[PDB]
Design a protein around this ligand. Structure first.
Ligand SMILES: *[C@@H]1O[C@H](CO)[C@@H](O)[C@H](O)[C@H]1NC(C)=O
Lengths: 50, 48
């Protein structure tokens, strides 16, 4: 698997047309805020491709 | 997309905007294609 390609499965809003997003920011998947630290309901949105 | 309009208005006023009519002619296009929500101008300085 060539793991050099990534994608953003998790975010808050859907982008407007012709927009780019390369930022590496955490997202909250539940009632527990992340605040820059991983844990429950908190995942890194960029995942490599196998 | 992006558009620039400009016009060299000739004035002899003191403080406020002039009274009269004059339109601006487009000059430049520059498609950066990013999130633009603010802009800032430049002010030069001088030293005695
Ligand atoms: C532009 O940035 C603001 C905050 O910096 C964000 O709320 C907004 O969704 C962004 N818009 C686009 C089109 O990227």
């Amino acid at each position: 698997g060539n793991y050099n390609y990534l994608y953003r499965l998790f975010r808050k809003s859907n982008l407007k047309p012709f927009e780019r997003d390369i930022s590496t920011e955490i997202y909250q998947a539940g009632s527990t805020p992340c605040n820059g630290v991983k844990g429950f309901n908190c995942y890194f949105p960029l995942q490599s491709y196998g | 997309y992006f558009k620039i309009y400009s016009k060299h208005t000739p004035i002899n006023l003191v403080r406020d905007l002039p009274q009269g009519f004059s339109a601006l002619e487009p000059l430049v296009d520059l498609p950066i294609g990013i999130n633009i929500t603010r802009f800032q101008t430049l002010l030069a300085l001088h030293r005695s």
